[PDB]
Amino acid sequence: DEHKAHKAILAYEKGWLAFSLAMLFVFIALIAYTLATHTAGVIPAGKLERVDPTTVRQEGPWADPAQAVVQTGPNQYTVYVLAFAFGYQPNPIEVPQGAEIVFKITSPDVIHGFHVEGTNINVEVLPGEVSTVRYTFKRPGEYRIICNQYCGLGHQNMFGTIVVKE
Amino acid sequence: EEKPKGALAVILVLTLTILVFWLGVYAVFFARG
Amino acid sequence: SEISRVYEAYPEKKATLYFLVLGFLALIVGSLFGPFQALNYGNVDAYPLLKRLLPFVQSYYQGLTLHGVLNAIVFTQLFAQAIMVYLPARELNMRPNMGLMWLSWWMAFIGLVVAALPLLANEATVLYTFYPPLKGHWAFYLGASVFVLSTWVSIYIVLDLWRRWKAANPGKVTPLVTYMAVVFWLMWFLASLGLVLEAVLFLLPWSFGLVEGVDPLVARTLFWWTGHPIVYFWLLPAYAIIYTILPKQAGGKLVSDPMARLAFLLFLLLSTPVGFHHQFADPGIDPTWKMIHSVLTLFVAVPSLMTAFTVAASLEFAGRLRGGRGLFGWIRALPWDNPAFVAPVLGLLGFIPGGAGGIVNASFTLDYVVHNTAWVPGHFHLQVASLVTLTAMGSLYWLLPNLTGKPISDAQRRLGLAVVWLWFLGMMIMAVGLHWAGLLNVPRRAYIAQVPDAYPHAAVPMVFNVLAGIVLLVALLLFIYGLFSVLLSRERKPELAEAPLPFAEVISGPEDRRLVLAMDRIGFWFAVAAILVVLAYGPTLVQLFGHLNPVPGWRLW
Numbered sequence: 052d053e054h055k056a057h058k059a060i061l062a063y064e065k066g067w068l069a070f071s072l073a074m075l076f077v078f079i080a081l082i083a084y085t086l087a088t089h090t091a092g093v094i095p096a097g098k099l100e101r102v103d104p105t106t107v108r109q110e111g112p113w114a115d116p117a118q119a120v121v122q123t124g125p126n127q128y129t130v131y132v133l134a135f136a137f138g139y140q141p142n143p144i145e146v147p148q149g150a151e152i153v154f155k156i157t158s159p160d161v162i163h164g165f166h167v168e169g170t171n172i173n174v175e176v177l178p179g180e181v182s183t184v185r186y187t188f189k190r191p192g193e194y195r196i197i198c199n200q201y202c203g204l205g206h207q208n209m210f211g212t213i214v215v216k217e
Numbered sequence: 218e219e220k221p222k223g224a225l226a227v228i229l230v231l232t233l234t235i236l237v238f239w240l241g242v243y244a245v246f247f248a249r250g
Numbered sequence: 251s252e253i254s255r256v257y258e259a260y261p262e263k264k265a266t267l268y269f270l271v272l273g274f275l276a277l278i279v280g281s282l283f284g285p286f287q288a289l290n291y292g293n294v295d296a297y298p299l300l301k302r303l304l305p306f307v308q309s310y311y312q313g314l315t316l317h318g319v320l321n322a323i324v325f326t327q328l329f330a331q332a333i334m335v336y337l338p339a340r341e342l343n344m345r346p347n348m349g350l351m352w353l354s355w356w357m358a359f360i361g362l363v364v365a366a367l368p369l370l371a372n373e374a375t376v377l378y379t380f381y382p383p384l385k386g387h388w389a390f391y392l393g394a395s396v397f398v399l400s401t402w403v404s405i406y407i408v409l410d411l412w413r414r415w416k417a418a419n420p421g422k423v424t425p426l427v428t429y430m431a432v433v434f435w436l437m438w439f440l441a442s443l444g445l446v447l448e449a450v451l452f453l454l455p456w457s458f459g460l461v462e463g464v465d466p467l468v469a470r471t472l473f474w475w476t477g478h479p480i481v482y483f484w485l486l487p488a489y490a491i492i493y494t495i496l497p498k499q500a501g502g503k504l505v506s507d508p509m510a511r512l513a514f515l516l517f518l519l520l521s522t523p524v525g526f527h528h529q530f531a532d533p534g535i536d537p538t539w540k541m542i543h544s545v546l547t548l549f550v551a552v553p554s555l556m557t558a559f560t561v562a563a564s565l566e567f568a569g570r571l572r573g574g575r576g577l578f579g580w581i582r583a584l585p586w587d588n589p590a591f592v593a594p595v596l597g598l599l600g601f602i603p604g605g606a607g608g609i610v611n612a613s614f615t616l617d618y619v620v621h622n623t624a625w626v627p628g629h630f631h632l633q634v635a636s637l638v639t640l641t642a643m644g645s646l647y648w649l650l651p652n653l654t655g656k657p658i659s660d661a662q663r664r665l666g667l668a669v670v671w672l673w674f675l676g677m678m679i680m681a682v683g684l685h686w687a688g689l690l691n692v693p694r695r696a697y698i699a700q701v702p703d704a705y706p707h708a709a710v711p712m713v714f715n716v717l718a719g720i721v722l723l724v725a726l727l728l729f730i731y732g733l734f735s736v737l738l739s740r741e742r743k744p745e746l747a748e749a750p751l752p753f754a755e756v757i758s759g760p761e762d763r764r765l766v767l768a769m770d771r772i773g774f775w776f777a778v779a780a781i782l783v784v785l786a787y788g789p790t791l792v793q794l795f796g797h798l799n800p801v802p803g804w805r806l807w
């Protein structure tokens with residue numbers, strides 16, 4: 052008693068810790084799996100890509116909204132998105148399906164979020180940096196973009212749109 | 218007295234809850250892929 | 251000029267009380283916005299009512315800034331500074347350097363007020379994360395800095411106690427509570443450097459006018475260096491009470507000293523080098539480094555997993571000592587009439603769905619499902635606003651008497667039990683509501699009641715959020731009532747203000763010595779933790795500091 056409960060507890064503790072680490076390593080193994088698959092495209096690009104925020108929408112790929120989309124391969128399209136104080140340019144973003152869309156997003160003002168409802172596209176958009184993500188939608192129709200980072204008094208109203216064509 | 222049946226039940230529930238959460242979202246991650 | 255002999259040989263008692271009072275006032279004020287926010291996520295706009303009550307409130311987001319700051323930052327730091335200075339001091343029966351201990355309180359008080367002015371005047375509606383380029387008033391940043399630096403005094407205070415005790419007891423193992431306190435404050439010191447650098451290098455010169463740009467990426471990297479460990483800095487003070495006082499309140503004993511020490515040792519090791527789990531959705535950060543940080547974060551869950559077993563066993567043991575039955579008998583044997591027992595127990599229950607939510611968010615790729623949704627607030631209210639606050643609330647039932655001498659009547663005791671159950675229950679409902687809607691893509695930090703038709707698919711969880719909002723509103727009121735009833739009565743027994751803190755017995759074994767001894771090599775372990783931080787952050791920080799891209803400030807409120 053008490054001393055008898057000490058050893059048993061400490062014994063089952065060691066078996067609990069062995070099981071727990073095992074379970075975590077399994078999780079580490081299924082996360083590594085996702086990294087090797089296609090779904091890993093939503094992980095933003097690692098290399099830094101600096102831009103001037105104060106000069107984004109008057110010069111360079113973000114300046115002209117009719118230019119935002121660009122075919123860069125045979126089945127690759129680069130969209131130059133601009134998340135700003137309560138809105139997204141272009142609106143709506145028009146892209147075909149079965150195509151690899153390479154979003155390159157930045158801000159002229161503050162931090163915004165880029166959350167494409169119904170997809171794994173969830174990226175922070177930082178002023179003076181380009182958030183580069185790759186995504187191939189499989190489902191055709193109405194994709195809404197939500198700003199999930201507080202960016203001012205109109206933040207709850209900051210909605211965007213992805214027009215992806217069947 | 219003996220085995221912590223009560224404790225091992227508790228961490229069983231905890232273990233089951235973690236899995237439901239992890240596997241459930243692990244699913245939803247691929248469905249939005 | 252001293253009216254109570256108590257405060258003259260235990261003057262730490264007084265300094266502890268002030269930290270506690272200031273902390274629960276901030277808790278109350280901050281908590282007022284809670285119910286309104288809950289209704290907001292129940293698609294109900296009650297804010298014109300709030301605006302009529304509190305006429306200085308300008309927006310939802312000013313409210314939300316006050317809610318975060320006053321509850322997550324102020325209440326929690328002042329509770330820590332109270333617990334993780336007073337409990338070691340009483341365990342050792344040593345007086346803490348009172349000159350420095352009062353200085354740390356004044357810092358906290360002047361820092362709070364200084365930062366309170368611009369917040370109350372809507373000059374710093376930037377939330378508790380204050381991300382650049384969102385630019386507040388200088389007096390918020392200055393105020394926050396002073397408030398946070400107060401902890402650096404606290405660290406010194408405890409270290410000092412610890413050195414002095416090592417002197418009087420050469421070659422002896424650091425006693426339990428003190429050991430936790432040490433590895434706690436040391437951990438906090440290492441953690442705090444990320445926020446200090448942010449403040450000193452960027453935010454402070456920026457708000458003062460010295461510079462006109464601040465890089466957002468390095469700003470939120472340094473932030474999250476401190477950003478995560480600070481949650482443990484909220485947590486460990488509750489853990490200390492759960493490990494070393496709860497078993498006594500239950501009627502049993504802490505089943506293991508070395509486990510407790512190992513739990514706290516790991517936290518000192520893994521609490522800091524895991525910030526990238528907050529930045530999974532950030533650009534400019536290498537994906538490999540994100541996977542690294544995701545692994546270490548899975549590891550930092552281990553201490554909690556250990557804790558789960560150690561505490562469960564200690565409450566099964568206590569239950570059996572009370573006349574425990576079979577598989578679930580020990581549960582019913584516990585002192586469910588005692589608020590100091592019930593409150594933390596309930597917090598632990600809800601901590602289970604809270605922890606799993608944490609592990610999910612920590613799975614790199616799976617974050618993209620939940621990041622910045624109502625799921626995250628769902629996650630942490632089970633953690634901070636449940637476990638921590640509840641442990642805090644219930645602990646008033648032994649800690650308030652012990653500092654003041656004021657007894658607690660049966661009525662106030664039963665009042666507590668109501669407030670505790672409601673708070674718990676209400677946090678539970680809310681949890682379901684926020685997780686649900688978070689899966690349905692509902693963003694967090696949003697005044698969604700102002701855009702009613704925006705989220706129709708969240709129909710039924712929006713009901714839960716309304717319910718909780720009502721439930722927790724009532725619990726709060728009863729808390730204020732009950733708390734002020736205890737703080738405004740002149741019933742005083744000076745004898746229970748001299749009664750020892752109900753510390754629990756520690757079951758010890760033979761194997762302990764050698765393991766406990768290696769853990770007491772704190773100077774070694776502190777450097778190990780220091781190196782881990784350099785390795786995890788160093789390579790990235792150096793790459794971000796060579797390519798600085800400061801952007802101008804914005805006010806968007």
Ligand code: HAS
Pocket residue numbers: 227379481482484485527528547548550551554555557558559561562565581595598599601602604605606608609610611612613617620621622626629630633634638
């Ligand atoms: C004080 C509160 C803090 C707790 C501690 C906490 C724990 C964790 N968190 Fe966290 N967290 C994250 C990962 C974790 C992980 C892995 C854990 C772990 O520490 C959890 C370990 C816990 C367990 C493994 C459970 C152990 C269970 C126990 C100990 C109870 C047993 C009960 C018993 C035995 C009682 C039985 C009694 C009877 C009577 C039977 C991640 C992802 O990696 C995000 C990012 C979301 C995003 O994208 O923004 C995050 C976001 C937050 C938010 C958002 C901050 C913001 O504004 O952006 C803050 C407040 C926060 C607080 C806290 N968090 N967390």
Ligand code: HEM
Pocket residue numbers: 281282283284285287288291314315317318319321322325326377378379627631634635636639694695696697718719722726
């Ligand atoms: C009185 C009971 C409480 C209720 C009903 C409540 C409700 C809420 C709600 C609905 C939100 C989401 C707001 C949004 O993201 O738009 C929230 C956020 C938050 N709550 Fe609570 N809360 C309560 C108590 C607490 C406590 C006790 C703490 C900490 C000790 C706390 C800390 C936080 C923090 C840090 C946030 C996020 C702030 C931000 O994202 O800017 N809350 N709360």
Ligand code: CUA
Pocket residue numbers: 135136137162163164198199200201202203206207209
């Ligand atoms: Cu931009 Cu929310």
Ligand SMILES: [Cu+2]
Pocket residue numbers: 477478479481527528
């Ligand atoms: Cu964290």
Ligand SMILES: [Xe]
Pocket residue numbers: 323378445
């Ligand atoms: Xe902070």
Ligand SMILES: [Xe]
Pocket residue numbers: 391394395449453
């Ligand atoms: Xe700060």
Ligand SMILES: [Xe]
Pocket residue numbers: 319323324361362365393394397
């Ligand atoms: Xe503050």
Ligand SMILES: [Xe]
Pocket residue numbers: 394395396398399445446449
């Ligand atoms: Xe700071």
Ligand SMILES: [Xe]
Pocket residue numbers: 477478480
């Ligand atoms: Xe935080």
